[PDB]
Design an enzyme around this catalytic site. Structure first.
Site, PDB file in Angstrom:
ATOM      1  N   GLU A 131       0.842  -1.225   0.000  1.00  0.00           N
ATOM      2  CA  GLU A 131       0.000   0.000   0.000  1.00  0.00           C
ATOM      3  C   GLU A 131       0.860   1.252   0.000  1.00  0.00           C
ATOM      4  O   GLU A 131       0.590   2.192   0.805  1.00  0.00           O
ATOM      5  CB  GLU A 131      -1.015  -0.011   1.148  1.00  0.00           C
ATOM      6  CG  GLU A 131      -1.963  -1.175   1.086  1.00  0.00           C
ATOM      7  CD  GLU A 131      -2.969  -1.253   2.202  1.00  0.00           C
ATOM      8  OE1 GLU A 131      -2.993  -0.349   3.087  1.00  0.00           O
ATOM      9  OE2 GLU A 131      -3.765  -2.235   2.190  1.00  0.00           O
ATOM     10  N   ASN A 172       2.389  -5.299  -2.960  1.00  0.00           N
ATOM     11  CA  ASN A 172       0.971  -5.641  -2.714  1.00  0.00           C
ATOM     12  C   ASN A 172       0.169  -4.356  -2.548  1.00  0.00           C
ATOM     13  O   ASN A 172       0.606  -3.420  -1.833  1.00  0.00           O
ATOM     14  CB  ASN A 172       0.872  -6.523  -1.487  1.00  0.00           C
ATOM     15  CG  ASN A 172      -0.475  -7.155  -1.286  1.00  0.00           C
ATOM     16  OD1 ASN A 172      -0.913  -7.911  -2.165  1.00  0.00           O
ATOM     17  ND2 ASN A 172      -1.064  -6.981  -0.087  1.00  0.00           N
ATOM     18  N   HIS A 208     -10.085  -6.572  -2.579  1.00  0.00           N
ATOM     19  CA  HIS A 208     -11.196  -6.238  -1.669  1.00  0.00           C
ATOM     20  C   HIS A 208     -12.321  -5.607  -2.439  1.00  0.00           C
ATOM     21  O   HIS A 208     -12.373  -4.356  -2.519  1.00  0.00           O
ATOM     22  CB  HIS A 208     -10.749  -5.368  -0.494  1.00  0.00           C
ATOM     23  CG  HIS A 208      -9.756  -6.063   0.365  1.00  0.00           C
ATOM     24  ND1 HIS A 208     -10.087  -7.212   1.101  1.00  0.00           N
ATOM     25  CD2 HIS A 208      -8.429  -5.855   0.616  1.00  0.00           C
ATOM     26  CE1 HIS A 208      -9.012  -7.608   1.779  1.00  0.00           C
ATOM     27  NE2 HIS A 208      -7.993  -6.821   1.477  1.00  0.00           N
ATOM     28  N   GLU A 238      -5.864 -11.067  -1.288  1.00  0.00           N
ATOM     29  CA  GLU A 238      -6.722 -10.801  -0.098  1.00  0.00           C
ATOM     30  C   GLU A 238      -8.189 -10.763  -0.525  1.00  0.00           C
ATOM     31  O   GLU A 238      -8.965  -9.922  -0.035  1.00  0.00           O
ATOM     32  CB  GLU A 238      -6.342  -9.491   0.609  1.00  0.00           C
ATOM     33  CG  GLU A 238      -4.877  -9.332   0.848  1.00  0.00           C
ATOM     34  CD  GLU A 238      -4.467  -8.121   1.665  1.00  0.00           C
ATOM     35  OE1 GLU A 238      -5.346  -7.390   2.137  1.00  0.00           O
ATOM     36  OE2 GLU A 238      -3.248  -7.879   1.781  1.00  0.00           O
ATOM     37  N   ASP A 240     -11.943 -10.759  -1.076  1.00  0.00           N
ATOM     38  CA  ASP A 240     -13.258 -10.853  -0.413  1.00  0.00           C
ATOM     39  C   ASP A 240     -14.170  -9.905  -1.159  1.00  0.00           C
ATOM     40  O   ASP A 240     -13.682  -9.005  -1.907  1.00  0.00           O
ATOM     41  CB  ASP A 240     -13.189 -10.613   1.087  1.00  0.00           C
ATOM     42  CG  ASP A 240     -12.506  -9.343   1.547  1.00  0.00           C
ATOM     43  OD1 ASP A 240     -12.455  -8.348   0.770  1.00  0.00           O
ATOM     44  OD2 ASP A 240     -12.042  -9.324   2.694  1.00  0.00           O
TER      45      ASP A 240
END
Ligand SMILES: *[C@@H]1O[C@H](CO)[C@@H](O[C@@H]2O[C@H](CO)[C@@H](O[C@@H]3O[C@H](CO[C@H]4O[C@H](CO)[C@@H](O)[C@H](O)[C@@H]4O)[C@@H](O)[C@H](O[C@H]4O[C@H](CO[C@H]5O[C@H](CO)[C@@H](O)[C@H](O)[C@@H]5O)[C@@H](O)[C@H](O)[C@@H]4O[C@H]4O[C@H](CO)[C@@H](O)[C@H](O)[C@@H]4O)[C@@H]3O)[C@H](O)[C@H]2NC(C)=O)[C@H](O)[C@H]1NC(C)=O
Ligand SMILES: O[C@@H]1[C@@H](O)[C@H](O[C@@H]2CO[C@H](O)[C@H](O)[C@H]2O)OC[C@H]1O
Length: 319
Positions: A131, A172, A208, A238, A240
């Site tokens: 990030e 990432n 996400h 990650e 979801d």
């Protein structure tokens, strides 16, 4: 026979799941986490972060990270190790320090060397920097960027490579999975690390996503190929897909279509090595406490029962 078996049959290395140490005392949870038909890879959700591993400067704490590695090793699962350099979940001593470039660089390099050396030979990949971008693709004004400048990114990669030359080194980020200013800037991070002469092996796409606002299979595949064209591998790290509560049959069906497109984009891209979901049961999802009014984001519900999204994943993996 399951998500991981299906993924390997299409040439992915894995389908996996994040977890966290407090959940490892829930035996029904751990039995399904340890089901290698569904999960061939584990990420520690918190216990390899900076505040967990170096809570005071030069004082390292590995017990909780090592518990997750030991579970993966007993099961025959791969590890993704997460994450070395990040602006969130920093211990107080980093965030409150009076730093010069020299002293913060030494502290950042010492963190990387110690943690990567401890985990040498145990990780498929490291999320080396997490990030680093604002949503407009400019550099996030973290303490590392403010004090060291842009060099902190390639120096972090080079420092990790020196301590473990075999592990895959990933950048990432989130909101880099669809075309836009941030994805363009993530491509430019790959290019910048190589221009510095440092090593980058992978781009980690957090994924996400939001039910009914998920990028299409074709938009996701264009962006995956955009990164693999640069001579790196990619993974969804990650995944979801958060829904506006309350849950309905219609929203669960949309969620299944959304998951199916993500899996299918990775299967359609040579160099997409895998998919990790950010835990696997809605019981333990990080989402509801962070995203007001959103939840139920995973392929199993809060009673460890499959939702339609499990079938959408299996379809996207061509099972
Ligand atoms: C804290 O201490 C550390 C350790 O001492 C300091 O680290 C130094 O940090 C420097 C950057 O701040 C870094 O410089 C970079 O080096 C790489 C590698 O260069 C070598 O290899 C190449 C390729 O063979 C070769 O061409 C070189 O001659 C070197 O041998 C370069 O890739 C980087 O080049 C980019 O940045 C420069 C400088 O950009 C700034 O200034 C210009 C003009 O003033 C300005 O226009 C720009 O907006 C910036 O403000 C550009 O001139 C280049 O064209 C490159 O720019 C492209 O890439 C950037 C991203 O990297 C983009 O943002 C840009 O738009 C463009 O696309 C650069 O020279 C040193 O290597 C590093 N030293 C060490 C030992 O690690 C650190 O500075 C210090 N921090 C503070 C705050 O004091
Ligand atoms: O338990 C939660 C974690 O699940 C959460 O994980 C973060 C989410 O934000 C970023 O995507 C990052 O890469 C992940 O590590 O972090 C907060 C913690 O309370």
């Amino acid at each position: 026979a399951g998500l991981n078996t299906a993924a390997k049959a299409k040439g992915l290395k894995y389908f996996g799941s994040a977890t966290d140490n407090p959940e490892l005392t829930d035996s029904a949870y751990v039995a399904q986490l340890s089901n290698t038909d569904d999960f061939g890879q584990i990420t520690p959700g918190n216990s390899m972060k900076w505040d967990a591993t170096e809570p005071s400067q030069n004082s390292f704490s590995f017990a909780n990270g090592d518990a997750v590695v030991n579970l993966a090793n007993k099961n025959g699962q791969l590890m993704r190790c997460h994450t070395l350099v990040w602006h969130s979940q920093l211990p107080n001593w980093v965030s409150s320090g009076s730093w010069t470039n020299a002293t913060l660089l030494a502290a950042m390099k010492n963190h990387i060397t110690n943690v990567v050396t401890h985990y040498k030979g145990k990780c498929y990949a490291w999320d080396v920097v997490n990030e680093a971008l604002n949503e407009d693709g400019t550099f996030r004004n973290s303490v590392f960027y403010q004090i060291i400048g842009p060099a902190y990114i390639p120096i972090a990669f080079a420092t990790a490579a020196a301590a473990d030359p075999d592990v895959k080194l990933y950048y990432n980020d989130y909101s880099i999975e669809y075309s836009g200013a941030k994805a363009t800037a993530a491509q430019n991070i790959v290019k910048m690390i190589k221009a510095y002469g440092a090593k980058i092996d992978g781009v980690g796409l957090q994924a996400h996503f939001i039910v009914g606002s998920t990028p299409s299979q074709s938009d996701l595949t264009t962006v995956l190929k955009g990164y693999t064209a640069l001579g790196v591998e990619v993974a969804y790290t990650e995944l979801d897909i958060r829904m506006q509560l309350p849950s309905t049959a219609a929203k669960l069906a949309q969620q299944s279509t959304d998951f199916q497109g993500v899996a299918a984009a990775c299967v359609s891209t040579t160099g997409c090595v895998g998919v990790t979901i950010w835990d696997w049961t809605d019981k333990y999802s990080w989402v509801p406490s962070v995203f007001q009014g959103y939840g139920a984001p995973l392929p199993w519900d809060e009673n460890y029962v499959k939702k339609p999204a499990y079938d959408g994943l299996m379809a996207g993996l061509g099972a």
